[PDB]
Amino acid sequence: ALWQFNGMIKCKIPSSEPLLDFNNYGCYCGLGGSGTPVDDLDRCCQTHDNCYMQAMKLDSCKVLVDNPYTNNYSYSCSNNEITCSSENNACEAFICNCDRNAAICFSKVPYNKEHKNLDMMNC
């Protein structure tokens, strides 16, 4: 679930404010997204967006009910390291890995504040 993805990002980047820092950034960081990613962070979000789309089409995920935004799963934060629990069902495990991969990706790319609030004409 979204609030859990927030926790994952905090796990990897303690000094960050997820819902603020990684929203309205580039062409993909935020609700929706299309076009050409402006930098590596934007590419992280593009990959995450595609991952969420796959989850919604996944056979193991029930129609709304198991959507990526509100479907809670089990995960752990150990020394700034994320772990998806083997207690998760197939649907939850897929979503948890979508988030885990993105959290890690965010932590390995530079943050360029000049890419915030870009108009669609730049995508």
Ligand SMILES: [Ca+2]
């Ligand atoms: Ca997006």
Ligand SMILES: [Ca+2]
């Ligand atoms: Ca669940």
